[PDB]
Amino acid sequence: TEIRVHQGDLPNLDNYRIDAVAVDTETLGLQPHRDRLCVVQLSSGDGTADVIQIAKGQKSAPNLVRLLSDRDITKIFHFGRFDLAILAHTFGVMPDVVFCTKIASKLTRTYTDRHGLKEICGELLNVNISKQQQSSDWAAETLSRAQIEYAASDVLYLHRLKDIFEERLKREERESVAKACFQFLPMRANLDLLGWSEIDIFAHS
Amino acid sequence: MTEIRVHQGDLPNLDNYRIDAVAVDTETLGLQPHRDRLCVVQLSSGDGTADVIQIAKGQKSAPNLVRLLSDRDITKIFHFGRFDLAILAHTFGVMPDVVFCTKIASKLTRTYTDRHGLKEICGELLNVNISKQQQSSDWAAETLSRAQIEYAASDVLYLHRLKDIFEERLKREERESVAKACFQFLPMRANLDLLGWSEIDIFAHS
Amino acid sequence: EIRVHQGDLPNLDNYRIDAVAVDTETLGLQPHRDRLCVVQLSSGDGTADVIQIAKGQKSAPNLVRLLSDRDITKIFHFGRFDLAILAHTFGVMPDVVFCTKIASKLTRTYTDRHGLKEICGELLNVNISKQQQSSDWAAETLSRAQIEYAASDVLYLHRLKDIFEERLKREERESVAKACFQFLPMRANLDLLGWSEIDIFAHS
Amino acid sequence: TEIRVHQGDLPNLDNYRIDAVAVDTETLGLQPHRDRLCVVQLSSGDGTADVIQIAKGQKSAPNLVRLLSDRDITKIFHFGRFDLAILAHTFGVMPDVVFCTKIASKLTRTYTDRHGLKEICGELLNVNISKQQQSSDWAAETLSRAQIEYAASDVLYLHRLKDIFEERLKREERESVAKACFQFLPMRANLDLLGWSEIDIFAHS
Amino acid sequence: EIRVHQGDLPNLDNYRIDAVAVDTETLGLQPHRDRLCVVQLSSGDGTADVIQIAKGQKSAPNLVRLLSDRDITKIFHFGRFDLAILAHTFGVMPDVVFCTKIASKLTRTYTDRHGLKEICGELLNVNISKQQQSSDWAAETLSRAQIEYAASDVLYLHRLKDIFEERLKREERESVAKACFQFLPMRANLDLLGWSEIDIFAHS
Amino acid sequence: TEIRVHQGDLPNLDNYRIDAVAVDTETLGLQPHRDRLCVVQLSSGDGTADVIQIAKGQKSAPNLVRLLSDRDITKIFHFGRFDLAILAHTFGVMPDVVFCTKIASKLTRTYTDRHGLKEICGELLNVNISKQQQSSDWAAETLSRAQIEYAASDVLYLHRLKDIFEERLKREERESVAKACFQFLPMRANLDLLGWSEIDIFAHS
């Protein structure tokens, strides 16, 4: 599996002249105001991935941010609620053309309450995600090989997952539902950054 | 005393509703729209009067009411519009797409409390006392009691005033775009409820 | 008025009727530990019979005839309990029953409060005072407060049943309610047999 | 051994001139108004099973429904509360002669709180049920062999379980209790469909 | 009338009796942290003695005589606590006790409310006011409200014990209650030794 | 491992001319008024055991009851609260000379909250209790070899556990505490039968 490791940014957009890009991040934790962005992962869906180490205090990443702001390119996430928050917090740009495989799973895999990436990859693709490195020092100057393979695996399969979920959403006639959820997702991420992360804004109480 | 006009089935006309925004509430036989039928629709133009419309069992249309609901030039003001939107679309087939919800607005602005119900908000923002005693009553009754009628009217008589104050706070705290986005999703949150996700926060990790 | 009896009704002169309201008072909620102390009856006419049951009493032929008579519907509020302590004490389980709590749950769909006090207040504007519910129901002489409270448990069940029957018809749930009432005695039996903490129909 | 797979309906009832039939279903989830019926499984208890795929929007299946309506044939379920709801919701017919092994288990296996099909088959028959395919896309146009074999395993043993539970119900003198529970079960399923699925209708509060 | 003492009773002239009502006040529920502040006594005659216990006070010989006197039953409400703090402070564990809280749990089977205020209200129509329960019981001079409150904890235990004895006999639970009172000093010891959060008889 | 299996009662007391006997029971469940006594197990501590099947409706077991009544013989249980209740409920005699290894564990193994028999046997004796048959039909006319061996394991080690616990109670100076707990245990079992099984009679609330 070809995994290209970069410092700071993509060197160019040559591998991403595409309509959709799979995106994930690694951080020091779940709290974007405390836990810095450490890694950004990308794949075009061709079976290879880019792993971008983000430095402490890094304010800019122009090639990555070009993709994030390109409205001709759908940003595919698994649980984009988190990735959108830390990406917009770090580089100042919120994507507004997105697809989330966790939301799509909640709308289509109605026979389960297990919507994690590992569960979804195994059921839909018979692909085994190993989570051992999720709890690791993502701020390390040199990521280990196990870390780099794990980070790549978070984006290697999102295109294939999106294709299946799009088929399920059509079959169950839920495309307009999903579209509305993906349209609000960036604001749900902004709500988290502004201080409503523990609040379901739509709940009665 | 408040002028309350009680109607059977529909408004007789829209002469009182050539306006920019209308306050709306419903009463039902309970919280489950597939089991508990729409019983009452309440409306107010914001002038201190209200219309109380009794909806019959099995009633499939309400042309004048549905006209307002579909009018993109009229903002429908709800308190917890998530519920009213679901039952209204379920009963008459039309989902409003221009809304303001004082419950969402409260959660975005009254950040110093966890109490976001209508009674609490009217008391704090307007010194108005809402009595909830009739909230649990037979809303399907053929003749509503005066207490039911006055309580149903009270749910819509203050929403314009609440919306004015919440708009001031949204602007003061720079949250107008957040609120607009939430209102834009609210009809789809209501449809999610009707489709079978009423117990699921669709944006949660688990 | 309220007629107080020891042991049994003297006769059935006041119960040549098609439906009778029934409630019980006990020393607590556990029939195998907490004996039956009182049985209250009403014909619906605004009078009640309050029957004190002795410790160790195993028979009351006039009361039990009513409980056994399939031509008389026994009206309860939460008959699940009364059916159990009555069957446990006298050995007979009534099988023609109406329960206002089940009726409430099937019709007052806008609330989770289905107790007798809430129901009497909402449907009849009648105030039930629960202060004597926690009292020594086994006292040889009941206080006037206990007697009037015990009577109030049965004075309004005919009127509640009439309104609930109207609502069950309106919402087209009559056959559902009938099936629930039909199972209620077996639900009471399940309680006496050891399943009182188990919803027998739940997945877990 | 033999699993016969059908589309739409049984071709006939040649294999079901019997006095009791084992029945299970598969759906897109637990919510009958949202999650459509996808598969109906049947067994005569002879070690063979019929697995019938149900199409989206299909509201009839005359051979199956004749069995379900036949008052001379007991329908054996495990947790019939669910199957009765989705069958009645889909086909318009509510079976009224039933046996449920889950209810039987709660009335006889008084030394445990584990009343699932897997646990009962292990204990009473030394038969292993694998539940890996319980969470799968039962709406698939073509089921996998693992799905088909799992679905069959839900009905292959219900006759044998019913025979043991009947022995136990007799031994502990609970036959009338079980019969009354089975008699109310179709109405408990109806209550679920009408909106009381989260309410123990017999509870005090 | 309430007699307020410093340190100890002056004599036992009021306590040549078969049973004495006892309660305590402390700085809190933890005996190893929260010192004994007050000890209250009543002979049952409608008067009380309120004894302020000083910080570091190691003895109270007249009080300890009553506590050690095998011919005098010590009546407590929730003796489990009083026995612990008394034994920890003065070194003596009473072994002849009656506890109205245990007695209530064994007889008032129609409720889960077994506090002293609830029991006095139901059995005696006596109103206990708990306002001073949270107050500085180590104060050098207790307020009148504190004093009256501390006395109210012992003024009615004789009358309660009499009713509870009647109920225990009626329901045939005397030997059960006696066994519970027999173990209560060791339950208190278990608390002092480090098991205050453990039901020693529970399966888990 | 020698296990003698009896119907109804011991044939005689020749193996139990001893100062202490280990006792356990098997039933159809945890509820003595619903779940009948099925098995009584006994051991003298010599590495052998007696397994006594109790018939439905059996009201008498004179040899077993002579031991339960013999004040010169300590009855050793693990969690005797249960065995005392079902034994007194079934045959009418409450033992009053008892040692409980669970209570002893709670008073000595202060470094853990795991006081089950399997945990204690592993830690104190390096003996492996297998609980697979705990959930089984103990009313069966013919018990399986696995059932009989498991039932025997419940009594084969209680003497050795008692000796160790007695040493620890002495070392930590808690002998009089344990003695009072054992003295009250028959009444705790009685309280259970009378209707307080869910109530800690000594709790503030």
Added chain:
Amino acid sequence: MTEIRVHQGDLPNLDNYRIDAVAVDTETLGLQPHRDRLCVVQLSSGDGTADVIQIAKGQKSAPNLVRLLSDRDITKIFHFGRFDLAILAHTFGVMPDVVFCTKIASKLTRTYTDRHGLKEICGELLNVNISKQQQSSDWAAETLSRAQIEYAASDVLYLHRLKDIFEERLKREERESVAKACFQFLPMRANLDLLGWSEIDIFAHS
């Protein structure tokens, strides 16, 4: 009758605070300092008078108030200083480091209760009734109501008296050094909150 001096932005001078200890409290738009701005700072010298300082949105300095908060010769008295210290440090950039907290003091002396709120403490120790009606109010309002102003003043008018009593109790129970150590750590506990550990007991095993 209680004299309350209301200021915009800052104290005009320190003439009323040439003292050894100052009572301090704050009002905000809520409990989350990164979202909910500092709206009011209240001060009292213990003399029965109070100063109520309205803080503007985006205000970053208040040099006279901040001098008080930085002056190591002046103990700042708080009730639940954990919160005030965090919002004050977040807003003005200075963390006070000589503090007394009546809530910590209460937890170490009122061992017979789990109710350690200011209302509860004032009633028991002083027979003073604190009314909490305005706690949930719009503290960012341009003009505070008389009710809000009197409530804000009441948070500081009694803290000197509470501190005296708690100091007596801490000496009596021989816990002065414990309290001192808790106070010394309190600014770091507040800093931990601002840094992202507000929901974590940093000293707990799990």
Added chain:
Amino acid sequence: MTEIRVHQGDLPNLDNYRIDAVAVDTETLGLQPHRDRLCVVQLSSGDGTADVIQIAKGQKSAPNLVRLLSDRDITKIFHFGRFDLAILAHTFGVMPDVVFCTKIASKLTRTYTDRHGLKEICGELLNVNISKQQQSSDWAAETLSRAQIEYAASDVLYLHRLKDIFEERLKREERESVAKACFQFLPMRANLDLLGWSEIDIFAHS
């Protein structure tokens, strides 16, 4: 292959502990210091060897150990020193005041996890397997088993290495002063436990 020196009562001398920091753990009869006596004290210099000291019932002194514990020129490294500081001070009358706690350090650096136990941290940072089987055993045994001895030694063999990594991370994330204030309060937090606040977060609002 691991040199573990076992002693009764005390170290025989301090020849192996002329060092700047010593790793310490304890074993007891349980988590309650007033009921559950000190049974073992373990030490390591960080050199791959350990000392395991059995403490007798009722023993109140251990002069060589206590000299180390009192030496302000030597940092005592603990994992969850809150517990060890309590039982050591309770048993020997001396409260160490120069300390490092790897559990607190983990909570301040391993921000991506709620698993801060010694086994999880050893596995993650060092790829070292801690086997907890003997944690539930009779530590008051007159003769400890080889398994008990090896387990006890494993609690202290790696704390120097953990300390060095956590120090790197505290520097990197700029939290050194935070950690230092936490370590500074930790002896008083242990004292609070001994005095009766072991179930109370003294800094919490409620």
